[PDB]
Amino acid sequence: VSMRDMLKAGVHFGHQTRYWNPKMKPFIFGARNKVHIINLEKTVPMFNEALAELNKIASRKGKILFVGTKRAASEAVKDAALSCDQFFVNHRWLGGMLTNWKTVRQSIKRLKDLETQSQDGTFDKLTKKEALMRTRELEKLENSLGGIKDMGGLPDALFVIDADHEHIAIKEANNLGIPVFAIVDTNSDPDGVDFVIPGNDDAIRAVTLYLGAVAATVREGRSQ
RNA sequence: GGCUGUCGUCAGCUCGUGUUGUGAAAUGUUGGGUUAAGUCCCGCAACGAGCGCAACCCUUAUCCUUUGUUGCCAGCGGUCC
């Protein structure tokens, strides 16, 4: 990645100053019309170090869970995780997805079963309205667990867009000792993140930049 | 012991695992709506489950098929009606 690419992507744009987290002071460059400006001179090396560590994780045949559920980030994170053969959560994070994996995997199994019943013709022997009921259940399980249906266990890393919004997932990973790589905007707490990447987590341009880079890095880790 | 009344056929009562709290406990089960209903949808540090709700049972209202006496009499003939 390059500083100029980041800047044209809008990565340097933090939040308004009245909403800052004071712990984000070392990564703030200044203010522009009451809005904090992130120091890309910190962002570039820190992102490059996160990229190298993620490359190593993908090289050990590791699973990376992409987490972003903001409306701006959902489709992009899904595309990024799919294009690099990884796992994602792009709709509401379910409390206990990781710390209560022994329970959530049962819903994943039910997702598998309902998907086969949708490609097995078992839905035809159903009383029409129950076909719609099971379709609703399949669709909701797909909304919430589609991205992790084949994860098969705890991931080896989390890549998070907007640490503040995804605080539950960060907390769960910390509880289970799973390294966290996050875009940490100026309003956010960097304390639960092992690899902090200071930057905008709201605009699609910046989000897509981060995600494309992470997907490419894990692809190179797999290929190498 | 068994059996029964009663709140009350009221919509409630819980649990596992997760998480919160030093703890009693909490969350789930609250919230926005909706329903006869913890009924359902949406949300949501909860994810799920069980007993309850509902359904499955009996009866009643319509129709079809089968059978046709001890029950029936529309069409035919006969009458002691």
Ligand SMILES: [Mg+2]
């Ligand atoms: Mg209650």
Ligand SMILES: [Mg+2]
């Ligand atoms: Mg309670």
Ligand SMILES: [Mg+2]
């Ligand atoms: Mg409510």
Ligand SMILES: [Mg+2]
């Ligand atoms: Mg119920």
Ligand SMILES: [Mg+2]
């Ligand atoms: Mg609820």
Ligand SMILES: [Mg+2]
């Ligand atoms: Mg009942």
